[PDB]
Amino acid sequence: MAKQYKNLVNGEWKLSENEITIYAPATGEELGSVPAMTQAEVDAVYASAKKALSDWRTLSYVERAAYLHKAADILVRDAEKIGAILSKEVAKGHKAAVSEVIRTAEIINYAAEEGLRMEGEVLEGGSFEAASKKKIAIVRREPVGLVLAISPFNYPVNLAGSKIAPALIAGNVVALKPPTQGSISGLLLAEAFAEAGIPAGVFNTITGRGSVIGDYIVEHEAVNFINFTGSTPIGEGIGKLAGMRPIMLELGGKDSAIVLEDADLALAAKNIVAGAFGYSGQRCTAVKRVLVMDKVADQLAAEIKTLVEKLSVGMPEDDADITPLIDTSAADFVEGLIKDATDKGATALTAFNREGNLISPVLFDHVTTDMRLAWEEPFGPVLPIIRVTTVEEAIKISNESEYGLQASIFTTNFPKAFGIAEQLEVGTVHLNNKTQRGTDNFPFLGAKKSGAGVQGVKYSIEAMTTVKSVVFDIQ
Amino acid sequence: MAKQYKNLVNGEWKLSENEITIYAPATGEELGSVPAMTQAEVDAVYASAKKALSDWRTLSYVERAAYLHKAADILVRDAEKIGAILSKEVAKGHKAAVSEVIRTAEIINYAAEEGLRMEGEVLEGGSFEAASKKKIAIVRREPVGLVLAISPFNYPVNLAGSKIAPALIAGNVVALKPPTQGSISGLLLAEAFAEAGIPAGVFNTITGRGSVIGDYIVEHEAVNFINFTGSTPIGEGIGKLAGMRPIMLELGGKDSAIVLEDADLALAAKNIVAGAFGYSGQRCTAVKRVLVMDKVADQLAAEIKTLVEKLSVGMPEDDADITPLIDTSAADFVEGLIKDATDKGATALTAFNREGNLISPVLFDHVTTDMRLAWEEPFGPVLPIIRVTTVEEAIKISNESEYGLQASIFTTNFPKAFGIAEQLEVGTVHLNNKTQRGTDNFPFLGAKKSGAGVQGVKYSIEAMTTVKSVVFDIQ
Amino acid sequence: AKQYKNLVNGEWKLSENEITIYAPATGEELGSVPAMTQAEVDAVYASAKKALSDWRTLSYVERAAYLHKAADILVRDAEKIGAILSKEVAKGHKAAVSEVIRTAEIINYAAEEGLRMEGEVLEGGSFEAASKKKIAIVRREPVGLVLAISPFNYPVNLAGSKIAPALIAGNVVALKPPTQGSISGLLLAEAFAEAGIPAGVFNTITGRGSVIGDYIVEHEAVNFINFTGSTPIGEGIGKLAGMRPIMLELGGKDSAIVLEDADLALAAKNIVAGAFGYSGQRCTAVKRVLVMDKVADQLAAEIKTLVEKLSVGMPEDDADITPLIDTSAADFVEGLIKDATDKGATALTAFNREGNLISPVLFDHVTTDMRLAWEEPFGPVLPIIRVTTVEEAIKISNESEYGLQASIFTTNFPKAFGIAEQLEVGTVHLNNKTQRGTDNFPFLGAKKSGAGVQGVKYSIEAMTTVKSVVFDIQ
Amino acid sequence: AKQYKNLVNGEWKLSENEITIYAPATGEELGSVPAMTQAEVDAVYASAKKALSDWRTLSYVERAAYLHKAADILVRDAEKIGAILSKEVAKGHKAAVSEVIRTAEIINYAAEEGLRMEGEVLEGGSFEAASKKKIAIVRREPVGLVLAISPFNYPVNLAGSKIAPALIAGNVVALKPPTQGSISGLLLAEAFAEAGIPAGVFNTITGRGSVIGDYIVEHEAVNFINFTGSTPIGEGIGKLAGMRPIMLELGGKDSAIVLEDADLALAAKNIVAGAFGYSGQRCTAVKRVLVMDKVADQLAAEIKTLVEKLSVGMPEDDADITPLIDTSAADFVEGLIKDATDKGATALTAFNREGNLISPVLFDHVTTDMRLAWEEPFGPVLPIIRVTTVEEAIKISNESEYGLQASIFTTNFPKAFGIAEQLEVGTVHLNNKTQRGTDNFPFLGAKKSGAGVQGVKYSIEAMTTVKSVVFDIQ
């Protein structure tokens, strides 16, 4: 039942002297163990990847795309088998975990076909000066080299594949460092690439304790690019450890949902509840605060309340909407935000209840900017409603956040919604819909402390490629 | 005629309590003084810029382009006046300094017209999944915010304008930090933008001592992007101080010129000498080592020697090819590399002579890779010739360098030259021509320790812009 | 009244015969233009094909410099050119000067858009592994000789919108202005000649359609025909072009769909400005209002009050409604007004005609059996058609043989976008009148409204081809 | 020998009359195809216009899935389709199977290229400050009904290269294969029908040119004609199209310019493979060698040795030179051989004809007064023309009415690029024979060789239009 998992290192499956046992956050069930790599074993992974780089980058785009398509087919075949373990490993609903594996296969296939249509440009010297009119630049794309991909606990397969496939199609070699709570899933994803016959050293995995290899994996001079999803403080550290090297960071969010007086309140409540409470609010791109005009606030709060009361609260195996949080510390942190809001006079529209790390969904009304819940990312099923008098106030409060991932605007006036969107300091603005990363072909980025670089399949490919210009004179 | 220069801060010209006197490196003549800003004065510059940002980004592209065109016209008008001071300030030939100011005006005009044709994209949700076929993403470009532009001593006007105009057209606000040896020229460039009527706070300058404001200007939370040209160690430090913030770094080069057996040796010698000895070798994109096939090495060295002996050695006012180096430390460093090469048995084809900081051009043959001159960037008029037996050896020696700015290949076999170019770890490869940044519409980038990001007018605009996606469903 | 000459191979040439041009509003003689023979058209094309090799080999910067100098000369002489243009096509004095300034803007924008011309590098390895070392260096090239045919209503603006995009790309051009508008077209040519455009690179042709009409188009020297004018002439040009590339800007019957939730005052303001601009003598003009019956009475009343305010008079007095281009045009418009009156449409503003000066006529209760519901008048007459559903509005809008542009006045934009997807038009304007601008935007027509896509960058792409150079890397 | 049917609105239909098809190499009866009437063509087009709305509103992913499913069926049945295709157009068995596999590759590539279709957002503030709040959301759209006309020499490959790019973009298609090749076109249609392509989305038309030839092109339901075939037929299609968009892939007389510094063995190998592939029945074949006199004797001797090694025989034996498509084609080739012999050209390989199987003829000392220097033979005959300067080679190359592709064999690449700029062709191959591939690369012809740019992404762009939605941000 509980297997001893191994790392993919240069086409071989390796155990380490020490290991980390992984337990199901909802039940405490032992799921297996992953290797606890040393720095010398991380060196072996990077040496194998740099050695494999020359033969991988010289393959055709077609040949590289064929491996990715083969990996995605194996993921679709084993979606139930991987989804069942993923569900237990990060306390995600069984169906939602299987959906994550299917979405990963879709992103791998889309990146394989997006990346193979890689084009260059021909520039004319005569565009700038007459004397150089016979000079042209043949500009072609090249891989950056070794990409270190760091996936998060909440999407350990999906936000590993969204980094791996775009890097691999471009001719880069990859080392996946999954989170410890999610490493069995990351290694199951690696088994699909290994079964697809990915050449030795082109795709590898690293698992271990942050105290032994956390900074080491990023600082290493073999790494040419770091692609990470995780907390803002960890991302801030990765940015300095990267030095001059290119990075892509997907960090926290405190996405606001601005509801104007002319909004469809039932549609706004439906989207706000689905977005805020999806995976018990353990998503960076979740709706984390409602900024509603006071005229429609009482009716909107009542409609959000009725929907929050319907949400099922239970175990991942029963596909509950609200499942247990990733760990005790996460649950304690969420309870502290709920306590601060209650003590400062916010109205609890739905009751707080906690059984283990299973916190019931809490909706708060009359939330003010002096409450921690107005600003701090909970990663838990708690949503504040902050009443505003003007749209200028809603923009001001929205932009006062250190985060700027996405925003939602619920209104029937789209020219005004576009004007508001221009002023919001976020990557994406959704009109009459919850904030969301999808569709995966769209750009996904965060302003301020929410990230660095632009994600979305083609943008991820462009970010993990460089340019080689060949200039010559026509005679 | 030594003037007391002032910094452009929020539409006003400000002196500081302390100042730095600038002297001509070739004669020791006092040229004037620039303010020695405090950290509180840097805070005032950044506060002015962030305040000016909202009204600047909301202007049309046409309005922003008009200011850039007006400033470029003022630079063309005052090219002799600016060029005369620039020549004395960095010991650059009088005509070459005037040419630099004219080239700056050309880049400003090209960036104003490139940036105003800024386009977005419309993506279809139906490209990724059938359920999202009515969902579209209107993706538009936005400024990153405040750009800190740091120009180098060797191109204090040209590599200030190449950062300022692309940032300004995109709707960013700028703070120019010129080098101390080059700050009078950076402030003369600022006077052209001020005379063009650039709004208060949109364009500002900072001058000061590295011990007082060096790290402070970069670390400051108001700065959203750092665009720097200078030494590799300084750029490495900037990368760390930037944290997660976007950067563009133009650092050192050790550009190799690979000469094959079928090369036109007279053309190779002409290009190699013009590129290696331009501005006494004080350029990052300059031929710094010749990797020549042994069969043609004696004839190529003889042809390079005859041309190096013709180079004039003297003062900037007399438009000498070889002028005095930027400072004593730079000339001492170059002399040390010449000494190491002589002591290790390299053949000096042209004699070493030094008068103050005026070093005569030294050509070395039979340079082996145990010599410091084979690897270290001198920033002086010294060129090694390294003989090889195979093109595999030339590629291996060229790639062993920590730098990878550009490379030159002299050969009549272009399909082979393209194959070699693919293997060279550089940004740009010039076929049958010296390495060069131009034309300014072409990408300019460095692999390895030569930089971060892609320069060239459109690439600079793209780098200093982000994306704002607005997603909605069609009904 | 001067005797104008054609620009042919850097020289100014008269022909044996000439055509005298009169002001449509006053009958004043403005001058004459040459009446070229087919042999003189041959000389223009021989000059252009000879000049093509040295023009296409110039840098993009050198070609852009000539365009910028021509645009500067147009700005300098905008009052001088605009004054003659105003008299020549009975356009308001200020509107005619604005047209010359807008032409200089398009020329400059084309010069800077075209010089940033880029190619592409394609990888053989994208399609098959065996061709991974094979790449294609794809670069843009001119099509060759472009014949540009401008219309009477925009004889300078819709001549420059064809000439500058063609010239920046390395093409040589022959401008054939309309006879009523040839003095303006030749004044535009004087600006390019003063800018020092090389001999044969830019030339003009003037003459009678019965002598050279089909001849200029069917000539084998012409590689591309870029025309603005009537649909029947455009249809003929398409056949005469054979396999050669074309760009056609033809008739319009633009609809303004007004929904129940629309801002009716804003809809009326935009509808009147768009429908009655230059007395309705524009292809991109609101030519039919398709309004929901619940809001039709109030919209009709608001359009009426604004139509009654429009000044009716002479071009020199900057009147909103000026005399029509010719008697035939005014007779045709009067016939459409008569047909609507006889079929029971309600004339909300009175019909009056003094010479070829027709007062603006607004009709309500227009049905699909009336000619005014379908035919392009090119006159100051606007029908209002009442509809019960948006499906009916889409159906009636698409039943037209034209599909240039449409306007949708509503506060529901997701629905407006859904309606826009169903309309068979090139452009849909939300809460605004139909318009060609801004000139960087695409401008095209579906069905009988055109062929090809205009707008500066689109015009450049259309009048260029590609040259692919393929080789294997070793 | 089966009785084949046309795919019409999801049903397989016979016509009252039929055309029996015979193998050009053996005379074997292969089956019959319907001889459609104009009323049956009307039914095909009515079905397609009706199916257009539900096809275009499907997602790109759903349209791509049908194309991928059709391509998989073609790979599965590649031997079955290839065996019939080989007999139908006297193409080698292995080459005919390869054609089906290449068609599946193009269908898959077009499905994935087309689904990443993007629009653009343009800023009014790029052109004028007053329009800075105005933006244009420009999205791609199908042109409507595409009539695809495939040629006899690539009846499956140059049917799929038109069908898949049109279908992914949301267009509906009617395939008109050539009569000699209609069984193969209908076998391709069976793969799309088995893939479950919706009724009316994809249809076929078969018939006699005297009954429906002009009718299929003239029909007002057709919005785009994509044709590969002879130049005179293409010229007629261009007129019949009127203002409607077209894509024409017509004749070629591709020149292979061999300079003094060329690798003559490489030049001979590529020249012979390109000139004699499918007995020279290809528009992209090398059809004339323009060689510098200093290296002409050695090059001709090297080409001769390779031509003498070409097998001459039947398609079932994978012979290099197989029987020509029909008697008329072989008679025409024999006439060009006769004109060259009578005018003094040197026959380096002997002329022999057995039925319509012509042996490969190599001619040297071919002059510009011989028909073989200019006319496309579509037969295994190649002239070698000697030139004294590269200027003469460019002049002779460009004197041709065709301009499909050119080859340049030389070791001086910067000079080869300079020559390529002067050649009036779509593509120039350096040190390699002319060829359409890879299918992601642009494929086009200058002068009488075509209209429009083919190659997968270029095909998709050509069979799409643009819909601009403009609004002001508040």
Numbering used by the authors:
A (entry chain D), B (entry chain C): 1 to 475
C (entry chain A), D (entry chain B): 2 to 475
From the paper:
GapN catalyzes the irreversible oxidation of glyceraldehyde 3-phosphate (G3P) to 3-phosphoglycerate (3-PG) while reducing NADP+ to NADPH. As S. pyogenes lacks the oxidative part of the pentose phosphate pathway, GapN appears to be the major NADPH source for the bacterium. The GapN-monomer from S. pyogenes, like its counterparts from other organisms can be subdivided into three domains. The monomers assemble into a tetramer displaying D2 symmetry which is formed by two interlacing dimers with dimer-dimer contacts primarily mediated by the protruding domain, while contacts within each dimer are formed by a β-sheet of the protruding domain interacting with a β-sheet of the catalytic α/β domain via salt bridges as well as α-helices (residues 232–251) of the Rossmannoid fold of each chain.
To further characterize the function of the S. pyogenes GapN and provide a starting point for future screening campaigns, we determined the crystal structure of the GapN by molecular replacement using the apo-form of an S. mutans tetramer as a search model. The structure revealed a covalent modification of the enzyme at the active site residue C284, which could be modeled as β-mercaptoethanol although this compound was not present during purification. Hence, the enzyme must have been modified following heterologous expression in E. coli. Determination of the crystal structure of the S. pyogenes GapN apo-enzyme revealed an unusual cis-peptide in proximity to the catalytic binding site. In all chains of the wild-type and C284S variant a cis-peptide was observed while only half of the chains in the reference structure from S. mutans were modeled in the cis configuration. Considering that the formation of a cis-peptide outside an X-P (X denoting any amino acid) peptide is rather rare, the electron density maps of our structures and the published structures were critically examined. This analysis confirmed the formation of a cis-peptide bond in both S. pyogenes as well as in S. mutans. As this peptide bond is within 11.2 Å of the active site, it might be relevant for the proper function of the enzyme.
